Amino acid sequence: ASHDKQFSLFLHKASAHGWKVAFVLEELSLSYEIVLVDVAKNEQKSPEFMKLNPNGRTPALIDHGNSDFVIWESNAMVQYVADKYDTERKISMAPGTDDFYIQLQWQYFQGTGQGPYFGQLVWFTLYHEEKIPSAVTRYKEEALRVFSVLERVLSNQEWLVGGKMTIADISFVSWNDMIVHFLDNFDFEKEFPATAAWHYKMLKRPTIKRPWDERRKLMSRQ
Amino acid sequence: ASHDKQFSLFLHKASAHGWKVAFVLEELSLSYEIVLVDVAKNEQKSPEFMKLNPNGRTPALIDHGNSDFVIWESNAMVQYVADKYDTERKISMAPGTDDFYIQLQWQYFQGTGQGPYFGQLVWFTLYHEEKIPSAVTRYKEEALRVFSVLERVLSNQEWLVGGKMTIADISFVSWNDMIVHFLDNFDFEKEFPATAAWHYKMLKRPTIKRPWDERRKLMSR
Numbered sequence: 492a493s494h495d496k497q498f499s500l501f502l503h504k505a506s507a508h509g510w511k512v513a514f515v516l517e518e519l520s521l522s523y524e525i526v527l528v529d530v531a532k533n534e535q536k537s538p539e540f541m542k543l544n545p546n547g548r549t550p551a552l553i554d555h556g557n558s559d560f561v562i563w564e565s566n567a568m569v570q571y572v573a574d575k576y577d578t579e580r581k582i583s584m585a586p587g588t589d590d591f592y593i594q595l596q597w598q599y600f601q602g603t604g605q606g607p608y609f610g611q612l613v614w615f616t617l618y619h620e621e622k623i624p625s626a627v628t629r630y631k632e633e634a635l636r637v638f639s640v641l642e643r644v645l646s647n648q649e650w651l652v653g654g655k656m657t658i659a660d661i662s663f664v665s666w667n668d669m670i671v672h673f674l675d676n677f678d679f680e681k682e683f684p685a686t687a688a689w690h691y692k693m694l695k696r697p698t699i700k701r702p703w704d705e706r707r708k709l710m711s712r713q
Numbered sequence: 714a715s716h717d718k719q720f721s722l723f724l725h726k727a728s729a730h731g732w733k734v735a736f737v738l739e740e741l742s743l744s745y746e747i748v749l750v751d752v753a754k755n756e757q758k759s760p761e762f763m764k765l766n767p768n769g770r771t772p773a774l775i776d777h778g779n780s781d782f783v784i785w786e787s788n789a790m791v792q793y794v795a796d797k798y799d800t801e802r803k804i805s806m807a808p809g810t811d812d813f814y815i816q817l818q819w820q821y822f823q824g825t826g827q828g829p830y831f832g833q834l835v836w837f838t839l840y841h842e843e844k845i846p847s848a849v850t851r852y853k854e855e856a857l858r859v860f861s862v863l864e865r866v867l868s869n870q871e872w873l874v875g876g877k878m879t880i881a882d883i884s885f886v887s888w889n890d891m892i893v894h895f896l897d898n899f900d901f902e903k904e905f906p907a908t909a910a911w912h913y914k915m916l917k918r919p920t921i922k923r924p925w926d927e928r929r930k931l932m933s934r
């Protein structure tokens with residue numbers, strides 16, 4: 492609304508979560524308009540935005556092609572998008588199959604295991620009132636542990652599920668690229684070779700590079 | 714496989730996450746056996762369990778009614794059970810509907826918002842190598858914020874989605890009951906009246922009380 496795209500995607504430019512959804516929209520050739528919700532100015536707690544998400548966090552999605560259907564939680568947004576619109580199953584497992592729920596498994600690992608613990612690392616590095624080395628260390632270690640989990644699997648198979656790149660793989664990309672800068676003496680390709688190759692393979696895709704490049708642009712300027 | 718139940722449910726007794734799955738299994742008349750994986754002995758990091766879940770955390774599920782299908786992540790386990798076995802849709806939204814994805818939304822809020830932040834509150838209270846009041850406060854405030862979000866919604870509608878109790882609602886129960894007993898001088902019913910009523914309504918269900926009673930038994934002297 493105010494644009495002619497199928498989706499409105501409300502996100503904060505610095506966040507991992509909205510760009511993840513952008514990746515998936517790009518893969519599926521779905522038109523979207525990015526609507527910036529600036530967490531730095533507390534806009535995610537604006538009453539207008541909280542009408543979209545009572546949690547008052549980015550991102551959120553409106554599907555103008557489905558009666559302006561509103562949905563939040565980035566993982567749920569991805570799932571909605573892929574399930575409804577990836578009917579050829581280019582990048583997703585078919586709903587109502589075993590593999591679908593393995594796909595779901597990995598997305599919950601992303602959303603509950605990668606996101607929150609990566610996020611606490613950033614928090615205690617950048618944002619917490621006190622600088623607390625033991626807290627920074629905690630979530631550094633946990634980030635590395637997450638990498639080791641991915642490596643455990645990816646060293647033995649190309650993709651997380653179904654023998655192809657899916658929304659399961661894609662979901663990890665944004666956070667994994669962001670977290671590198673927050674780890675000391677860290678050589679991603681050296682420490683986790685299979686995970687690194689997997690990561691940088693996806694990031695090379697124009698469908699993923701484009702949105703990520705736009706994040707970069709948006710962030711270069713205040 | 715040593716028992717004749719449809720499901721092996723691997724959980725740690727003290728964790729919120731396994732019992733959640735139990736709730737759903739009970740609701741859906743599905744037979745299961747609980748297999749305790751003892752985090753106190755680091756059993757979740759054993760080679761045997763890590764074959765089930767490379768993440769090396771509880772819980773995990775084996776569906777012996779589906780060729781010993783193995784799945785982990787408690788929210789994914791719930792969705793699998795419900796989607797496959799709630800054919801009359803007693804407590805779940807139909808796959809391939811808008812409401813399914815609102816249902817999924819709320820489960821992700823549970824899994825990514827309630828769980829991890831509640832967990833960090835417990836961690837910095839009990840387990841961290843040093844006491845850090847600013848860290849405890851952070852996650853104590855976040856916990857209350859989660860309650861606030863539920864209250865914002867549940868004070869204006871009975872259930873989270875679809876006008877009935879679903880796995881969306883059920884998913885919150887175990888962590889909520891743990892945190893409200895965890896927190897000192899906290900009057901749940903006073904502080905968040907709609908959420909409290911919604912909470913205790915579910916906990917009164919025999920299908921939910923049964924597993925929760927078993928947890929309390931296991932947790933006790």
Ligand SMILES: N[C@@H](CCC(=O)N[C@@H](CSc1ccc([N+](=O)[O-])cc1[N+](=O)[O-])C(=O)NCC(=O)O)C(=O)O
Pocket residue numbers: 503504505506507530531532610613618669672709710711712713
């Ligand atoms: N004050 C708010 C955050 C305000 C803020 O500055 N937000 C950041 C995003 S947080 C953030 C900041 C840096 C990185 N990072 O890639 O290193 C990741 C995240 N993040 O969202 O997890 C932002 O808008 N930056 C815009 C810009 O850079 O121009 C808080 O305390 O959480």
Ligand SMILES: N[C@@H](CCC(=O)N[C@@H](CSc1ccc([N+](=O)[O-])cc1[N+](=O)[O-])C(=O)NCC(=O)O)C(=O)O
Pocket residue numbers: 503505506507508530531535547548549550563564565566602606609610611613614618825826
């Ligand atoms: N589980 C949700 C998580 C959404 C989320 O984390 N949203 C953040 C994005 S911004 C963000 C996300 C991560 C981090 N970080 O520090 O890791 C910093 C920032 N930030 O803008 O300051 C947000 O709105 N936070 C503001 C708030 O909670 O009030 C999802 O996947 O959609």
Ligand SMILES: N[C@@H](CCC(=O)N[C@@H](CSc1ccc([N+](=O)[O-])cc1[N+](=O)[O-])C(=O)NCC(=O)O)C(=O)O
Pocket residue numbers: 727728729752753835839840891892895932
């Ligand atoms: N070595 C492990 C210890 C694991 C452990 O012993 N489990 C805890 C439960 S963790 C826990 C403790 C308190 C609360 N709580 O909400 O009060 C929630 C959780 N939890 O598992 O989420 C426990 O009390 N069991 C041993 C016993 O009962 O003898 C660690 O440090 O994390």
Ligand SMILES: N[C@@H](CCC(=O)N[C@@H](CSc1ccc([N+](=O)[O-])cc1[N+](=O)[O-])C(=O)NCC(=O)O)C(=O)O
Pocket residue numbers: 599603604725727728729730752753757769770771772785786787788824828831832833835836840
């Ligand atoms: N997202 C996953 C979360 C799984 C999870 O948290 N598992 C815990 C359960 S025990 C647990 C869960 C929460 C808390 N807590 O402190 O809140 C304490 C304990 N504990 O046993 O010490 C675990 O295995 N932890 C051990 C590990 O990571 O190595 C899911 O929903 O399945």
Ligand SMILES: [Cl-]
Pocket residue numbers: 501502503504506507508509510549550
């Ligand atoms: Cl976002």
Ligand SMILES: [Cl-]
Pocket residue numbers: 723724725726728729730731732771772
């Ligand atoms: Cl568990």
